């Protein structure tokens, strides 16, 4: 009977509703706004986690680490543009050497 | 000659692109971005859009020229413009 | 006493890679990411409501904010998921 | 394609570059600059019409452009 289950989500619709109400965003919060927002957040984390799991699998590992998150983000142009001004701790850099270097 | 042209342009403030061509360009971009519903444009909306575009382009040219000088040239190249966009970094250069 | 989206991120991870785990630091990064995106979208929706002299943040502001913040292909599927969820929710 | 992007003429682009202080301009700079201006306008116009149709309007207002620029990180002042 939870709103998350009723909407088919794994993210907490009630918690998002409370955060919207308590965050000084507007006086009132519609009923579908937390549902929409939770769905969007769940979709975004699903995308990131899928790419990161693939990056970890390609490294022959079964645990995602900040390095894998960084590899997943900086290799998808959409996510790379979304998280443009974001620094990931312990993420390193992409293995990119200029072409004039390698002889 | 170019020197007096630069000195004359850098003390003026009027827009350098022609309003009607700019308006046509903006409108055709808008109709490419539409979802089957056409829009109108306040005269001030197009002036605002053109004031921002020209300022953006002028600043971009200033940056690109610094790159030209760094390379030892006095002639601005497309690679100097492309690199200035890359250093500005995906939101300021775009 | 300190609420975290760790359990939900872990559920989504189990859905998408049923046999992969996630480190604690990576989970903290995922929590930072969710909070950051939530704040972005909510702030934009607030600004929209204030621009239109409205006092309510509805699912229409969330959709428009998603369209403004997310790059194109991301935003398409994001609004797909959002409208799908609100339909499934109002259908009950 | 025939026009509307060629409306941004070489003398106009040259005036922009001279105000920027460019002393000497190559010939491929014109096509480069038309492309840059196009991609700049596409980003701002998209957001402007997004605002404009979130409000249930059909006219792109100056404030819609101002909000689009402000959200993209460029604040414009003469149109409040």
């Amino acid at each position: 009977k939870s709103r998350s289950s009723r909407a088919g989500l794994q993210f907490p619709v009630g918690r998002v509703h409370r955060l919207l109400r308590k965050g000084n965003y507007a006086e009132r919060v519609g009923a579908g706004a937390p549902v929409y927002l939770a769905a969007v957040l769940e979709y975004l984390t699903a995308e990131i986690l899928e790419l990161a799991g693939n990056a970890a699998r390609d490294n022959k590992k079964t645990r995602i680490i900040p390095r894998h998150l960084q590899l997943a983000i900086r290799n998808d142009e959409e996510l790379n543009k979304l998280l443009g001004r974001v620094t990931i701790a312990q993420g390193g850099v992409l293995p990119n050497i200029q072409a004039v270097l390698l002889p | 000659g170019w020197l007096k042209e630069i000195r004359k342009l850098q003390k003026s403030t009027h827009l350098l692109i022609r309003k009607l061509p700019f308006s046509r360009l903006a409108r055709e971009i808008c109709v490419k971005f539409t979802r089957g519903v056409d829009f109108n444009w306040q005269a001030q909306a197009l002036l605002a859009l053109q004031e921002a575009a020209e300022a953006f382009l002028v600043h971009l040219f200033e940056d690109a020229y610094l790159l030209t000088l760094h390379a030892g040239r006095v002639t601005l190249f497309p690679k100097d413009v492309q690199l200035a966009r890359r250093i500005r970094g995906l939101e300021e250069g775009l | 006493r300190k609420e975290s989206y760790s359990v939900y991120v872990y559920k989504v991870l189990k859905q998408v890679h049923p046999d992969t785990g996630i480190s604690s630091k990576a989970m903290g990064i995922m929590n930072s990411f969710v909070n950051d995106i939530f704040e972005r979208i909510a702030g934009e929706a607030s600004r929209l409501a204030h621009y239109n002299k409205r006092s309510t943040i509805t699912s229409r502001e969330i959709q428009t904010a998603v369209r403004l913040l997310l790059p194109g292909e991301l935003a398409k599927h994001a609004v797909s998921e959002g409208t799908k969820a609100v339909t499934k929710y109002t259908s009950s | 394609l025939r026009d509307n992007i060629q409306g941004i003429t070489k003398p106009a682009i040259r005036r922009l570059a001279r105000r920027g202080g460019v002393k000497r301009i190559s010939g491929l700079i014109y096509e480069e600059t038309r492309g840059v201006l196009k991609v700049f306008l596409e980003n701002v116009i998209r957001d402007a019409v997004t605002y404009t149709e979130h409000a249930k309007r059909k006219t792109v207002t100056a404030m819609d452009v101002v909000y689009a620029l402000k959200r993209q990180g460029r604040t414009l002042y003469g149109f409040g």
């Binding site: 900086r74 290799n75 998808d76 142009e77 959409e78 | - | 292909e73 797909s80 | -």
Partner: peptide
């Protein structure tokens, strides 16, 4: 190329500073 669960092709950020034609 590379497609996710949704039909979202996640292209890699090749190059954007260069104008197209």
């Amino acid at each position: 190329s590379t497609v996710t669960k949704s039909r979202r092709i996640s292209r890699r950020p090749s190059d954007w500073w260069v104008v197209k034609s």
